[PDB]
Symmetry: C3
Subunit: 106 residues, 3 copies
């Protein structure tokens, strides 16, 4: 995968979670989110195609996605135990990290 | 993702496979299982938050998930060729590895 | 996951994309494709079980899957922006890379 594809996928999965009903619908979406965050962690963003792989912008771009995946894991564990409303609140809070990570590298 | 989220997801996907009908339902679940095992391989479990990354407990925790993903790949290849009953038997055997890996790090 | 499981999964997801209707059906399939390509990048194929990890056959087998995942990311970004027909054309072109990578390591 590439970068903006992962970002757009995180957005759309957050919306699906916003309109989900049962714990399975929330859980598979959160797993799609984890997959997209992982792929984006392996990606190269628009704002730094030719920086150094050891350049602070480059590796901060990836610590950002590790950070996002941690909150995703919190939300996943909530969804698996059936805590649907708790997981949806965790996801609406995930939105902030998603959006801030997005605009920082558009 | 984090650890117990992946473990709970493997459990739930194994149950879905236990109650699946066609090869697609088994195959996508087995791919969710592979994704969860991969994420858990990248995770830090409850029983060893502050061990060494080169501590035998730490890396054995991860060889365990590599081991699990191998059997998952067997089951996936069975499901893709349409061998639905074969893949479900492979998954009910996957349960043992899943559960033993679980209790070992609760 | 293992190798031929990932290859068969890429084939089947390409067929699902060939018969998809809305952007979500194309997008989740393309994400299953990215996941399978990633797993296969972490796999060991049939034609080189006991080569060197630094053997040119071995690492070329994996640059091939990095290459495949790049086109998958293109198709994902197309699907996320709602460009359904564009993403399906990108996938029917993905088929060539998939098949050539397949026969090269059967
Ligand atoms: Zn990975």
């Amino acid at each position: 995968a590439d970068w903006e594809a992962a970002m757009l996928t995180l957005l759309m999965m957050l919306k699906v979670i916003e309109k989900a009903d049962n714990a399975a619908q929330v859980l598979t979406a959160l797993w799609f989110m984890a997959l997209a965050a992982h792929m984006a962690a392996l990606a190269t963003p628009p704002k730094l195609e030719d920086k150094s792989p050891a350049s602070p912008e480059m590796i901060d771009f990836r610590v950002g996605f590790e950070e996002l995946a941690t909150e995703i894991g919190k939300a996943i564990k909530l969804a698996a135990l059936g805590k649907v409303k708790e997981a949806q609140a965790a996801a609406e809070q995930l939105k902030t990290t998603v959006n801030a990570h997005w605009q920082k590298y558009r």
